[PDB]
Design a protein around this ligand. Structure first.
Ligand SMILES: O[C@@H]1[C@@H](O)[C@H](O[C@@H]2CO[C@@H](O[C@@H]3CO[C@@H](O)[C@H](O)[C@H]3O)[C@H](O)[C@H]2O)OC[C@H]1O
Ligand code: XYP
Length: 190
Protein backbone atom coordinates (compact mmCIF):
# COMPACT_ATOMS: atom_id res chain seq x y z
CA UNK A 1 0.00 0.00 0.00
CA UNK A 2 0.88 3.69 -0.01
CA UNK A 3 3.07 4.78 2.90
CA UNK A 4 4.81 7.73 4.53
CA UNK A 5 8.62 7.78 4.74
CA UNK A 6 10.02 4.81 6.61
CA UNK A 7 11.62 1.41 6.27
CA UNK A 8 10.45 -2.14 6.69
CA UNK A 9 9.92 -5.39 4.88
CA UNK A 10 7.02 -5.96 2.49
CA UNK A 11 6.36 -9.32 0.81
CA UNK A 12 9.90 -10.40 1.57
CA UNK A 13 11.59 -7.25 0.25
CA UNK A 14 13.11 -4.54 2.33
CA UNK A 15 11.94 -1.07 1.42
CA UNK A 16 13.19 2.40 2.21
CA UNK A 17 11.31 5.58 1.35
CA UNK A 18 12.79 8.94 2.31
CA UNK A 19 11.85 12.48 1.41
CA UNK A 20 12.84 16.00 2.45
CA UNK A 21 9.41 16.85 3.82
CA UNK A 22 8.26 18.57 0.69
CA UNK A 23 4.99 17.34 -0.71
CA UNK A 24 4.23 15.97 -4.12
CA UNK A 25 5.31 12.32 -3.81
CA UNK A 26 3.30 9.13 -3.45
CA UNK A 27 5.24 5.93 -2.72
CA UNK A 28 3.40 2.59 -2.90
CA UNK A 29 4.56 -0.93 -2.08
CA UNK A 30 2.96 -3.60 -4.23
CA UNK A 31 2.98 -7.39 -4.43
CA UNK A 32 6.25 -9.24 -4.28
CA UNK A 33 9.19 -7.10 -5.30
CA UNK A 34 7.05 -4.33 -6.81
CA UNK A 35 6.85 -0.68 -5.85
CA UNK A 36 5.62 2.44 -7.57
CA UNK A 37 6.33 6.13 -7.23
CA UNK A 38 4.16 8.94 -8.59
CA UNK A 39 5.30 12.50 -8.10
CA UNK A 40 4.27 16.00 -9.14
CA UNK A 41 6.34 19.09 -8.30
CA UNK A 42 8.16 17.13 -5.61
CA UNK A 43 11.12 18.03 -3.51
CA UNK A 44 13.99 15.61 -2.94
CA UNK A 45 13.07 11.94 -2.38
CA UNK A 46 14.45 8.43 -2.87
CA UNK A 47 12.73 5.11 -2.32
CA UNK A 48 12.43 1.53 -3.44
CA UNK A 49 12.73 -2.16 -2.66
CA UNK A 50 15.49 -4.70 -2.20
CA UNK A 51 17.45 -6.17 0.69
CA UNK A 52 18.52 -5.38 4.24
CA UNK A 53 21.32 -6.31 4.55
CA UNK A 54 22.57 -6.30 1.00
CA UNK A 55 25.65 -8.19 -0.11
CA UNK A 56 28.86 -7.46 -1.98
CA UNK A 57 28.13 -9.88 -4.83
CA UNK A 58 24.39 -9.65 -5.39
CA UNK A 59 23.04 -9.82 -8.93
CA UNK A 60 20.03 -7.52 -8.83
CA UNK A 61 17.22 -7.78 -11.38
CA UNK A 62 14.68 -5.06 -12.15
CA UNK A 63 11.97 -4.36 -14.67
CA UNK A 64 9.03 -2.08 -15.24
CA UNK A 65 8.30 1.49 -16.22
CA UNK A 66 10.33 4.63 -15.51
CA UNK A 67 9.01 7.95 -16.85
CA UNK A 68 10.49 10.99 -15.16
CA UNK A 69 9.65 14.55 -16.18
CA UNK A 70 12.69 16.39 -14.87
CA UNK A 71 15.44 15.54 -12.42
CA UNK A 72 15.30 11.89 -11.38
CA UNK A 73 17.29 8.70 -11.52
CA UNK A 74 16.76 4.95 -11.31
CA UNK A 75 19.54 3.11 -9.52
CA UNK A 76 20.79 0.34 -7.37
CA UNK A 77 21.22 2.30 -4.16
CA UNK A 78 22.71 1.32 -0.85
CA UNK A 79 24.97 1.97 2.10
CA UNK A 80 27.75 0.45 4.10
CA UNK A 81 28.75 1.22 7.68
CA UNK A 82 32.16 1.38 9.34
CA UNK A 83 33.02 3.12 7.12
CA UNK A 84 29.85 4.94 6.15
CA UNK A 85 29.47 4.92 2.35
CA UNK A 86 26.52 5.82 0.16
CA UNK A 87 26.55 4.33 -3.34
CA UNK A 88 24.52 4.48 -6.54
CA UNK A 89 24.68 2.33 -9.67
CA UNK A 90 22.60 4.56 -11.93
CA UNK A 91 20.79 2.75 -14.75
CA UNK A 92 18.73 5.66 -16.09
CA UNK A 93 18.20 9.34 -15.35
CA UNK A 94 16.13 12.34 -16.41
CA UNK A 95 17.19 15.91 -17.12
CA UNK A 96 20.32 16.04 -14.92
CA UNK A 97 23.31 13.73 -14.71
CA UNK A 98 23.50 13.01 -10.96
CA UNK A 99 27.27 12.48 -11.05
CA UNK A 100 27.71 16.19 -11.87
CA UNK A 101 30.22 17.66 -9.47
CA UNK A 102 31.65 14.28 -8.46
CA UNK A 103 35.20 13.24 -9.36
CA UNK A 104 35.58 10.70 -12.14
CA UNK A 105 37.61 7.67 -11.06
CA UNK A 106 37.55 5.69 -14.30
CA UNK A 107 35.20 3.35 -16.15
CA UNK A 108 33.86 -0.19 -15.77
CA UNK A 109 31.98 -2.42 -18.19
CA UNK A 110 29.13 -4.44 -16.76
CA UNK A 111 25.88 -5.98 -17.94
CA UNK A 112 26.04 -4.63 -21.48
CA UNK A 113 27.30 -1.08 -20.97
CA UNK A 114 30.27 1.01 -20.04
CA UNK A 115 29.74 2.96 -16.82
CA UNK A 116 31.63 6.03 -15.64
CA UNK A 117 32.59 5.79 -11.94
CA UNK A 118 32.88 8.71 -9.56
CA UNK A 119 33.02 9.73 -5.95
CA UNK A 120 32.43 12.82 -3.89
CA UNK A 121 32.43 13.67 -0.19
CA UNK A 122 29.10 14.56 1.42
CA UNK A 123 29.52 16.83 4.44
CA UNK A 124 26.93 17.11 7.24
CA UNK A 125 24.21 15.51 5.11
CA UNK A 126 21.33 13.16 5.92
CA UNK A 127 22.26 9.50 6.16
CA UNK A 128 21.25 6.19 7.65
CA UNK A 129 23.03 7.26 10.87
CA UNK A 130 21.72 10.81 11.00
CA UNK A 131 23.59 13.93 9.94
CA UNK A 132 26.98 12.68 8.83
CA UNK A 133 29.98 13.05 6.57
CA UNK A 134 30.75 10.25 4.15
CA UNK A 135 31.95 9.41 0.68
CA UNK A 136 29.32 8.86 -1.98
CA UNK A 137 30.17 6.62 -4.91
CA UNK A 138 28.58 6.59 -8.35
CA UNK A 139 28.61 4.30 -11.35
CA UNK A 140 26.58 5.84 -14.20
CA UNK A 141 25.45 3.64 -17.06
CA UNK A 142 26.09 5.13 -20.49
CA UNK A 143 23.39 3.08 -22.25
CA UNK A 144 20.34 4.00 -20.19
CA UNK A 145 17.70 1.39 -19.47
CA UNK A 146 14.70 0.71 -17.25
CA UNK A 147 15.00 -3.10 -17.03
CA UNK A 148 18.11 -5.16 -16.51
CA UNK A 149 20.38 -7.09 -14.22
CA UNK A 150 23.21 -5.51 -12.27
CA UNK A 151 26.22 -7.50 -11.09
CA UNK A 152 27.03 -5.31 -8.12
CA UNK A 153 30.43 -6.94 -7.63
CA UNK A 154 31.74 -5.41 -10.85
CA UNK A 155 30.98 -1.93 -9.54
CA UNK A 156 32.25 -2.57 -6.02
CA UNK A 157 35.51 -3.94 -7.48
CA UNK A 158 35.95 -0.98 -9.82
CA UNK A 159 35.47 1.44 -6.95
CA UNK A 160 37.81 -0.56 -4.71
CA UNK A 161 40.60 -0.25 -7.27
CA UNK A 162 40.52 3.53 -6.71
CA UNK A 163 40.33 3.38 -2.92
CA UNK A 164 36.86 2.29 -1.75
CA UNK A 165 36.83 0.19 1.41
CA UNK A 166 33.31 -1.16 1.77
CA UNK A 167 32.36 -1.75 5.36
CA UNK A 168 29.42 -3.72 6.65
CA UNK A 169 26.61 -3.75 4.11
CA UNK A 170 23.39 -2.01 5.11
CA UNK A 171 20.39 -1.75 2.82
CA UNK A 172 20.63 -2.31 -0.93
CA UNK A 173 17.61 -1.43 -3.07
CA UNK A 174 16.48 -0.51 -6.53
CA UNK A 175 15.42 3.05 -5.99
CA UNK A 176 13.69 5.88 -7.77
CA UNK A 177 14.98 9.34 -6.87
CA UNK A 178 13.46 12.67 -7.76
CA UNK A 179 14.66 16.21 -7.25
CA UNK A 180 12.09 19.00 -7.74
CA UNK A 181 10.37 17.24 -10.61
CA UNK A 182 7.44 15.07 -11.65
CA UNK A 183 7.22 11.51 -12.90
CA UNK A 184 6.05 7.99 -12.44
CA UNK A 185 7.74 4.65 -12.05
CA UNK A 186 6.58 1.08 -11.43
CA UNK A 187 9.48 -1.28 -10.75
CA UNK A 188 9.67 -4.96 -9.81
CA UNK A 189 12.84 -6.13 -8.07
CA UNK A 190 14.22 -9.66 -7.72
O1 LIG B 1 14.97 8.86 10.45
C1 LIG B 1 16.26 8.66 9.91
C2 LIG B 1 16.02 8.60 8.35
O2 LIG B 1 15.46 9.82 7.86
C3 LIG B 1 17.32 8.26 7.67
O3 LIG B 1 17.06 8.03 6.32
C4 LIG B 1 18.13 8.20 5.44
C5 LIG B 1 18.49 9.66 5.28
O4 LIG B 1 19.43 9.82 4.17
C6 LIG B 1 18.83 9.40 2.90
O5 LIG B 1 19.73 9.69 1.97
C7 LIG B 1 19.59 9.85 0.95
C8 LIG B 1 21.11 10.38 1.29
O6 LIG B 1 21.37 11.11 0.01
C9 LIG B 1 20.68 11.70 -0.91
O7 LIG B 1 21.37 10.75 -1.72
C10 LIG B 1 19.53 11.11 -0.41
O8 LIG B 1 18.90 12.09 -1.30
C11 LIG B 1 19.45 11.36 1.11
O9 LIG B 1 18.33 11.81 1.56
C12 LIG B 1 18.56 7.96 2.94
O10 LIG B 1 17.92 7.58 1.72
C13 LIG B 1 17.67 7.57 4.12
O11 LIG B 1 17.63 6.15 4.17
O12 LIG B 1 17.78 7.05 8.18
C14 LIG B 1 18.20 7.29 9.62
C15 LIG B 1 16.88 7.45 10.33
O13 LIG B 1 17.30 7.65 11.74
O1 XYP C 1 27.89 -5.98 -25.60
C1 XYP C 1 28.21 -4.95 -24.72
C2 XYP C 1 28.83 -3.76 -25.46
O2 XYP C 1 27.82 -3.36 -26.25
C3 XYP C 1 29.02 -2.83 -24.32
O3 XYP C 1 29.80 -1.67 -24.58
O4 XYP C 1 30.03 -3.12 -23.39
C4 XYP C 1 29.45 -4.33 -22.81
C5 XYP C 1 29.18 -5.53 -23.62
O5 XYP C 1 28.76 -6.63 -22.74
Amino acid sequence: STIQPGTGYNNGYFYSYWNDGHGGVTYTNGPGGQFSVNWSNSGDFVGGKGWQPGTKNKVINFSGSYNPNGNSYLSVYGWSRNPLIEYYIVENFGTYNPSTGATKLGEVTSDGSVYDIYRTQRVNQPSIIGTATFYQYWSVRRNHRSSGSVNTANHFNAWAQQGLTLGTMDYQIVAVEGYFSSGSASITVS
